[PDB]
């Protein structure tokens, strides 16, 4: 079904590095240069106040829509990743349901400016106070802290490409039917990421990468906060939240 479902040679691992970085470049959503350039476009105090005066439900709806847009690029990244389309559909869905949000959270560090603790949202950079109307301050603070910690690693685009491929191809996800195929693909993507780090003298980041439990905790908090919002505004979720968002985070 795929070369990377068995043992790959050094030349084949080098080919895998190029392939992953290409799949990522084609599906990165926003170019890094475009995010960096917009760092000087920051929401004013008046604009921050305007966001804080928005209703909780309208802010939740806008954030769900923007997250869904980011998730659609992750689905395309997965489709272009070597081996992914050769997995069975059950496994493709298991991996995307568990990992799409984790990849979005990792990618989001590119849109986070550690100098002033702001994130790119709706055309400008804003601090965590911009999202106060959501009523999930702990989750926002945790996402900002996570982004701050990844920003301190100074990831290159190729490092994000290889690291996010591994975040997605996790053979430990419950529900995988072809677990051994996923393990071999994950082993080869791990070799590709570690080969690239070795070649670029960046192996010091391996001990500094966040534990898997960290991305899991952020995803669990997101689902928990959504359940609280859904109990308050059930018809907003039913009528105005994107269907893909609901399939991933609220069971349909």
């Amino acid at each position: 079904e795929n070369l990377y479902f068995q043992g790959a040679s050094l030349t084949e691992i080098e080919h895998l590095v190029q392939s992953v970085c290409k799949s990522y470049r084609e599906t990165c959503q926003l170019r890094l240069e475009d995010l960096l350039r917009q760092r000087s476009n920051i929401f004013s105090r008046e604009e921050v106040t305007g966001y804080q005066r928005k209703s909780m439900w309208e802010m939740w709806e806008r954030c769900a829509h923007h997250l869904t847009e980011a998730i659609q690029y992750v689905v395309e990244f997965a489709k272009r990743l070597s081996g992914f389309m050769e997995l069975c559909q059950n496994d493709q869905i298991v991996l995307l349901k568990a990992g799409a949000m984790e990849v979005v959270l990792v990618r989001m560090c590119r849109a986070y400016n550690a100098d002033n603790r702001t994130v790119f949202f709706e055309g400008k950079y804003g601090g965590m106070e911009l999202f106060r109307a959501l009523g999930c301050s702990e989750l926002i603070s945790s996402i900002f802290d996570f982004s701050h910690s990844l920003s301190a690693l100074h990831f290159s685009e190729d490092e994000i490409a290889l690291y996010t491929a591994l975040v997605l191809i996790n053979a430990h996800r419950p529900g995988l039917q072809e677990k051994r195929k996923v393990e071999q693909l994950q082993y080869n993507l791990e070799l590709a990421f570690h080969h690239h780090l070795c070649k670029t003298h960046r192996q010091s980041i391996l001990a500094k990468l966040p534990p898997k439990g960290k991305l899991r905790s952020l995803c669990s908090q997101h689902v928990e906060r959504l359940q609280i919002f859904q109990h308050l505004h059930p018809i907003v979720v039913q009528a105005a939240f994107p269907p893909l968002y609901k399939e991933l985070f609220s069971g349909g």
């Binding site: 559909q89 493709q92 869905i93 893909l244 609901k246 991933l248």
Partner: peptide
Amino acid sequence: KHKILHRLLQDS
């Protein structure tokens, strides 16, 4: 019971 993932995966 929204099911968009299978559609996105199947669309080429």
